[PDB]
Design a protein around this nucleic acid. Structure first.
Ligand SMILES: O=C([O-])C(=O)[O-]
Ligand SMILES: [Cl-]
Ligand SMILES: [Mn+2]
Ligand SMILES: [Mn+2]
Ligand SMILES: [Mn+2]
Ligand SMILES: [Mn+2]
Ligand SMILES: [Mn+2]
Ligand SMILES: [Mn+2]
Ligand SMILES: [Mn+2]
Ligand code: NA
Length: 327
DNA sequence: CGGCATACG
DNA sequence: CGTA
DNA sequence: GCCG
């Protein structure tokens, strides 16, 4: 009925089990904060299964046979069905550890391992970090300086304005180069916390060296509040606002046209969808997938793809448009 | 039991 | 280590 | 935590 991999089923952005999936994703996030990547994956996959269902789960019976639902995740759902609340989920939500790790890892430049060390050192608030600035990287300094703006949702109106600015710099850097919106906005999201663009050129090889030229041109237009210094740039952009501006996270990626379908697939997401697609590729088809290509390790050859549709066909999967990849 | 995606900065 |  |  329900296939076991997220890449085998459509998952829309909005669905019929929002509250249940949100609770399982709390437990997934908490597992990640404790270094338990296996438990994180199971809770993420269980949440995703619910997102793919055609109607609301009303009774425990309806979980029988669903993949990734065992004793633990089924108990979470049963408590939510019976009481409207899962005691374990609420305990996590309320915990100082969860709240502080969430706060710290949401900083650009701070991962789980840094947040955990800071937690163990007794630090709890952003102002605690600002009081010891010499212990921060340039990237963390930027993430902390801009943290408030970076916590404010990006709207689709913002995205269209940013895309025009990036296109202008890309056109000067290399006439004929193209700019494609990726990430969650390509999956149909109306808001996000960052904007992603994928840049290529129709003539293989002409894109070499492009990203430095693009960044220099954005920087001299005064639009770059932060960048590293390549084929991936993780920036903070200055975005105009009524009578002011706000900081926005923007990722710029370059790929040659031979790699573009793979890069588009990977950068469009969702994260879980791509992990599941790569898992499926390797475990079920014996092929190795990343955002550069698809490798047959037995013949030692790369698959040529001209489209995302090609890639799904290579893997024997029915095609899913981006708006159904919201695993 | 082992596995859990796979890259770049 | 961080980032996607 | 769950799957094969
Ligand atoms: O930023 C994200 O979450 C994405 O683009 O999928
Ligand atoms: Cl684990
Ligand atoms: Mn348990
Ligand atoms: Mn009860
Ligand atoms: Mn994104
Ligand atoms: Mn991004
Ligand atoms: Mn590359
Ligand atoms: Mn084991
Ligand atoms: Mn375990
Ligand atoms: Na972070």
């Amino acid at each position: 009925w329900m296939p076991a991999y997220a890449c085998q089923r459509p998952t829309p952005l909005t669905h019929h089990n929002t509250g249940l999936s949100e609770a399982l994703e709390i437990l997934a996030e908490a597992a990640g904060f404790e270094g338990s990547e296996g438990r994180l994956l199971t809770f993420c996959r269980a949440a995703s299964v619910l997102k793919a269902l055609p109607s609301p789960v009303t009774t425990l019976s309806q979980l029988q046979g669903l993949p990734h639902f065992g004793e633990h995740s089924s108990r979470v759902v049963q408590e939510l069905l019976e009481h409207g609340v899962c005691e374990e989920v609420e305990r996590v939500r309320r915990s100082e550890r969860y709240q502080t790790m969430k706060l710290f890892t949401q900083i650009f430049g701070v991962g789980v391992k840094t947040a955990d060390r800071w937690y163990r050192e007794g630090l709890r608030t952003l102002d605690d970090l600002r009081e010891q600035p010499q212990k921060l990287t340039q990237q963390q300094k930027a993430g902390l300086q801009h943290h408030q703006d970076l916590s404010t949702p990006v709207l689709r109106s913002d995205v269209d304005a940013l895309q025009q600015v990036v296109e202008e710099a890309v056109g000067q850097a290399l006439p004929g180069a193209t700019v494609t919106l990726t990430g969650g906005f390509r999956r149909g999201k109306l808001q996000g916390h960052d904007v992603d663009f994928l840049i290529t050129h129709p003539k293989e090889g002409q894109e070499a060296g492009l990203l430095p030229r693009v960044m220099c041109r954005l920087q001299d237009q005064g639009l770059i509040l932060y960048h590293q210094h390549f084929e991936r740039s993780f920036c903070i952009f200055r975005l105009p606002q009524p009578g002011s501006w706000k900081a926005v996270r923007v990722d710029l990626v370059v790929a040659p046209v031979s790699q573009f379908p793979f890069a588009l697939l990977g950068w469009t997401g969702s994260k879980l969808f791509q992990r599941e697609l790569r898992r499926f590729s390797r475990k079920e088809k014996g092929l190795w997938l990343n955002s550069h290509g698809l490798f047959d390790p037995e013949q030692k050859t790369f698959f040529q793809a001209a489209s995302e549709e090609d890639i799904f066909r290579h893997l024997g999967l029915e095609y899913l448009p981006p708006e159904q990849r919201n695993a």
